[PDB]
Every structure is written in structure tokens, then in C-alpha cells.
């Protein structure tokens, strides 16, 4: 599994692969690991599938719950804190093999500079959190390959599109060196999923664009 997130001028992007494994066996090819949790926030999760999906769903439900009760969404720090508390709450089961790490990407509408409103927060198994100032972050079994790739490719990010291509390429390198992360399946037409968030909100990146970007990467590597 690999989830990537990077900031571009005025927005943020998050992408994730589609592969589910049980040990060495492939048990999933169309899996979705990146979710839109609220109008301006998206979460990608790595680890035990059951716990991961429960995290994403329950987290979105919690945010919208606070929004409807108090008439205003949580501050971004509040969202961070609740996700962290959820992870810390799962620590016990994580020690027993039901581990799940989230990666949070958002656009803070209360931020000072509408271009520096992008937010990327990483977590550890104890619910430690980090707001990333260096522009990108990844989680999962291929996160070190994806981060080391983005370390070289990030200078190419100049708008909401170059960022998507650097994300997809980082996922490509992750799948290139990590068998638990799935790369582009041109035979079946299955590509990573992506969500992009700017001042207009959080939207799903259409599949066709990720397909064309992936093909560009592949033919570039041939």
C-alpha cells in the first residue's frame, strides 16, 4: 500500500494505489484507499483493510456530526486532534495486528494565505501527528520509495496538474520497488485513485486523466 499527498500552489493532492493483499496473495485489484471525508478534507489510510475503512467512514461521520450539532465545521486542528485520538484509541488492537495509519490532506478555509492553505498531516501508531512543512508525505509499505521519488520530482510541481503527475509517478516508483503496492494495470484498465482539494473544495480526479498520466510515465520509462 502507498498513499501520497503533496501541496501545489493553492491546493493539495492525494493519491493511492488499488492493491489488497493477504500475505503474498493478491486479494484485491480495485480497492479504494483515499476517501473524501468532508467538503475540504480527504483521508488515505494504510494497513489492515477492515480497520482502515472503519477509520475513514467513522471519521467522516464524526466531522459531519460536529458540524450539524454546532452549526460550524471543526477547525483544522480539531480534525487533526480527533483523527489522532482515534488512532491512539486503536493502539491496543494495532499491537495485536489490526494496525492502520492515516494520512490527512486538506484545504484550510480559515488559513491566512489562500495559497498556503494546503495541509498535509501524517500520523504514527500512537496517534502522534505532524503537519508537513516540506510539501509532501506518504504512508504505507511503499512510502519510503514514494517519498524518495517526490524528493527528486517535487521541483516540477508548479500547478494543480504537475502535482498530480508527480503524485502518480511517486506511486509508480512505489509499485516498482514494493510488491504490496499495485501499479497501473493496463490490461484491466485499473489506475490509482486521486482526490484534489482547492478553495472550491475536494473533488475526485477523473480516472481518464490518471490513465493518460500513467501511460505518459510508462512510455517515458520505455
Amino acid at each position: 500500500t502507498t498513499i501520497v499527498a503533496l501541496k501545489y500552489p493553492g491546493g493539495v493532492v492525494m493519491a493511492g494505489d488499488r492493491r489488497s493483499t493477504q500475505g503474498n496473495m493478491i486479494s484485491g485489484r480495485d480497492v479504494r484507499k483515499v476517501y473524501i471525508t468532508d467538503d475540504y478534507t480527504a483521508t488515505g489510510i494504510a494497513g489492515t483493510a477492515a480497520v482502515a475503512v472503519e477509520f475513514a467512514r467513522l471519521y467522516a461521520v464524526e466531522l459531519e456530526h460536529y458540524e450539524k450539532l454546532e452549526g460550524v465545521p471543526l477547525t483544522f486542528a480539531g480534525k487533526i486532534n480527533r483523527l489522532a485520538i482515534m488512532v491512539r484509541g486503536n493502539l491496543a488492537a494495532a499491537m495485536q495486528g489490526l494496525l492502520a495509519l492515516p494520512l490527512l490532506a486538506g484545504y484550510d478555509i480559515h488559513a491566512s494565505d489562500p495559497q498556503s492553505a494546503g495541509r498535509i498531516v501524517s500520523f504514527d501508531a500512537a496517534g502522534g501527528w505532524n503537519i508537513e512543512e516540506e510539501g509532501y508525505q506518504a504512508v504505507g509499505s511503499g512510502s519510503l520509495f514514494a517519498k524518495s521519488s517526490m524528493k527528486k520530482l517535487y521541483s516540477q510541481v508548479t500547478d494543480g496538474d504537475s502535482g498530480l503527475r508527480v503524485a502518480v509517478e511517486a506511486l509508480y516508483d512505489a509499485a516498482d520497488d514494493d510488491s504490496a503496492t499495485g501499479g497501473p494495470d493496463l490490461v484491466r484498465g485499473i489506475f490509482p485513485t486521486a482526490v484534489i482539494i482547492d478553495a472550491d473544495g475536494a473533488v475526485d480526479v477523473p480516472e481518464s486523466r490518471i490513465a493518460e498520466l500513467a501511460r505518459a510515465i510508462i512510455e517515458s520509462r520505455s
Binding site: 467512514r57 467513522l58 461521520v61 459531519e64 456530526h65 450539524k68 450539532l69 452549526g71
Partner: protein, 218 residues
């Protein structure tokens, strides 16, 4: 026995009769909630779930308690099963049960009146649903409009003569504010929201300030 119940019912009826009025009526785009509310941050209309809205009249802390309890019920059920299993009929039923218990067992009955409204999901053609729950847990499902709080009869008649099915948003608004008058408003005295059947997921949306003034000029 009969004297305590007479007193509870009487207290609740008087308390509701003293409060401002609320109207909810079905129109071509969904359901419209209009309530006399001079405040600028205290709410009488709220979102319950994706396609389910909530309106109340009476003592604020009480119908706000009920509002939060309904949100809790809806979110908990949607989590336990699925978001499509949460319905307006369910919320109305649970509000009837709860207000029955309050009316019968709490130290003082709730001086509140409730409306639960549901519009169709995006792309589905389903008639809106209006539910009315009273201070004692009595529930009725109206097809066109619900009026709550204050002196309801003149407003109910005003709507009875002036209501038309599948009206435009502006038309329904004008008719609603007109019926409210008979019992001069504007943006500073109104709280208006709508269950918008044309929105993909969350149908509830508020109409405030400049937009509301635009709809009021007509």
C-alpha cells in the same frame, strides 16, 4: 391521574401558544422552512440527515435538546447500517416515542412542537414527506404544509387558500411569509432554509442575507 395530565398538557399547550410560528411546505424543488426568528445565531431549523430536515417551535433549550438527540439517532443509525437506511419516517417515529416519554415522565413536559421533513434522493422522483410531532408524542404526516407555534389557525387557513403544489421557490416563500404575517418580517426577522432535492448528497441549505432579500423582492 387525570388532573396531573390535564396540567401537563395545559402547560405545554400554553408554552407553545406563546412562542413564534414556523411553517414548512413542499414545493417543486423540495421543502421550504420559514420561521419567525429575530436572532442571528440561535436556530429553529437545522439539518438532521442527508435528505432529512428539522424544524421546531417553543422553548429553545428543549427543542434544541430534541434536535441534538435526533442528530445523534440519525448519525448512529447511518453508521450502524447505512446512510440510505436513515429515513424521515424513522426520525418522526423516534421523536414521537421520545416526546411521549418526556410528556409522561420528565419533571416538566416539553413546550415544543416538531416537524421532520424528507425529500427524495438525487435523481429519484419521490413526493416530499412532512411530519408533525406534538408535545405529547402525537404524530401526523401532512402532504402539503405544517404550521407550528403561536396562533396557528390563521396561518393554516392562509396557507389552505393560497397554497399550490409544485410552486416555485420564490412563490412558496412569498406565500409562506404571507401566511406567517396573518398571526412585516423580512430578512432581519426570518430564518429560512430549504431541503433542496436537486443537490447530490446533503439537501439542506440556508437562504440568508442578500440571497433571501433577493427572493423576497420577487
Amino acid at each position: 391521574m387525570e388532573q396531573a395530565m390535564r396540567e401537563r398538557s395545559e402547560l405545554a399547550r400554553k408554552g407553545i401558544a406563546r412562542a413564534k410560528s414556523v411553517v414548512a411546505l413542499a414545493y417543486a424543488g423540495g421543502v421550504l422552512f420559514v420561521a419567525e426568528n429575530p436572532s442571528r445565531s440561535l436556530q429553529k431549523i437545522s439539518e438532521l440527515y442527508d435528505r432529512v430536515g428539522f424544524a421546531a417551535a417553543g422553548k429553545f433549550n428543549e427543542f434544541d435538546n430534541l434536535r441534538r438527540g435526533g442528530i445523534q439517532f440519525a448519525d448512529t443509525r447511518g453508521y450502524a447500517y447505512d446512510r440510505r437506511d436513515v429515513t424521515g419516517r424513522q426520525l418522526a417515529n423516534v421523536y414521537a416515542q421520545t416526546l411521549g416519554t418526556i410528556f409522561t415522565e420528565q419533571a416538566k413536559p416539553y413546550e415544543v412542537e416538531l416537524c421532520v421533513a424528507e425529500v427524495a434522493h438525487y435523481g429519484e422522483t419521490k413526493r416530499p414527506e412532512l411530519y408533525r410531532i406534538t408535545y405529547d408524542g402525537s404524530i401526523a404526516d401532512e402532504p402539503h404544509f405544517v404550521v407550528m407555534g403561536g396562533t396557528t389557525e390563521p396561518i393554516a387557513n392562509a396557507l389552505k387558500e393560497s397554497y399550490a403544489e409544485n410552486a416555485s421557490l420564490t412563490d412558496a416563500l412569498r406565500i409562506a411569509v404571507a401566511a406567517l404575517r396573518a398571526g412585516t418580517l423580512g430578512v432581519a426577522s426570518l430564518e429560512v432554509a430549504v431541503l433542496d432535492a436537486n443537490r447530490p448528497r446533503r439537501a439542506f441549505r440556508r437562504i440568508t442575507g442578500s440571497a433571501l432579500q433577493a427572493l423576497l423582492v420577487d
